[PDB]
Amino acid sequence: GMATPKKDVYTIASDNSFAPFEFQNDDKQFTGIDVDLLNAIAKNQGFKLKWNFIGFQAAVDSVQSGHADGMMSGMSITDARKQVFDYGSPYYSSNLTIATSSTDDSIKSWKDLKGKTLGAKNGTASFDYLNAHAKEYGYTVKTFTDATTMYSSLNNGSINALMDDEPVIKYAIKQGQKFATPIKPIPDGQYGFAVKKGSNPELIEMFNNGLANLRANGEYDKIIDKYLESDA
Template identity: 40%
Template sequence: MSKKTIAYLLMGVLLLALGLTGCGGQQPAGGGEKAAVLKVGTEPSFAPFEFQGENDKEYAGFDMDLIRAIGKQMGMQVEIQSMGFDGLIPALEAGNIDVVISGMTITDERVQKVSFSKPYYKSGLTIVTKQGNDQIKGFGDLAGKRIGVQIGTTGADEAKKIKDAQVREFNTPPEAFMELKAGGVDAVINDKPVNDYYMKEAGSKDAQQVGEPLTSEDYGIATAKKNTELSEKINKALDELKKNGEYDKIYEKWFGKKP
């Protein structure tokens, strides 16, 4: 066999090996192309948006169904991670997660740190007091009162503006509601849908929701400032879900009415 023939054979083997390597990268073991993973951060104690029942393994709620539908629309596998609400944006900035969906209000302060999707839900702040409390009828009656809030939320921000208020911050809304029931605070300020859900599920016997909503707030899905491509894809998927009716189905499932 000549040296030229040997060279041709070696070149053929090399090209074949390169071709197989390329195929192997596109078809991972197990068959089929592996979907990209969307790492989602949430604080799962904000029913009906995100929560976990005692016997449930998966997180449930409006936000959870929505982000899974968005992931499916984008062709991505959704992985949800639980963390404290005040740690969500730092985790996003550090690159530990790709997305935050956690009943997060779009605010000027947060926009300085992260990018938000188009608003997907309109909310507002309301007050819950103990049943029979006739001293607090609205936000104007909260001066000097003991107020329970969730740490890192717009409810906490607004409570701190109230004159002489004694603001107590809790990690989750249920902890604030428990403190209200125990008499440790006079009122709880939280997002209206969360207060509505608490009243419906557990609080109507010993609590009451009073006054008109203080604010009108938009919830958004947060992404890192530098990840403009992902933000655009999320907005596109959200638009598609609204067009094909899937968003309406999810909304009606959790709020009992169409948006």
């Protein structure tokens, strides 16, 4: 239904370092998909916000304790989370996807992964997927303990490709990396805006109504495209 504010300002908790969703620019101001998108949603609906960029764990606990009204933080919607949060309509799909070098034209479909070296960060959803499909597609998996070493290996040619959460890859491309995403991604759920279960229902109404308007009026795509290599 139509959303009416019941607070002069709503407090939103978020991560302090989760690019491209929320991160600091060179001027030390917070920015990102979540920041621009929720700000644009509130503005569309005539709500006011105050952001607390405190970290994922801290943001969860702040909403649960009533010290924040909502959480916008690259948050994967899960059944475990639904036990204690209510979510707005999902605002972005999460995918696991393959990054190649943009200079390498040899990988055009999944069948071209035959004989390739694929990187993944140890213990991640990308790692689990790659391990589970290595025999089928015929690649070999090389594991990394952190993100920097993995992306360095793709750039120096010691892996042919890697799998990661798609926003990380598409943001690196937007930043200037010579990567591409030439093949089909693997759906892996959705991102959601959350309030404590049973709390601030009008803030969820705001969210859903504002989001629908931004999807229809083009601003939603403009915001995503600012941060993620768009296909268009």
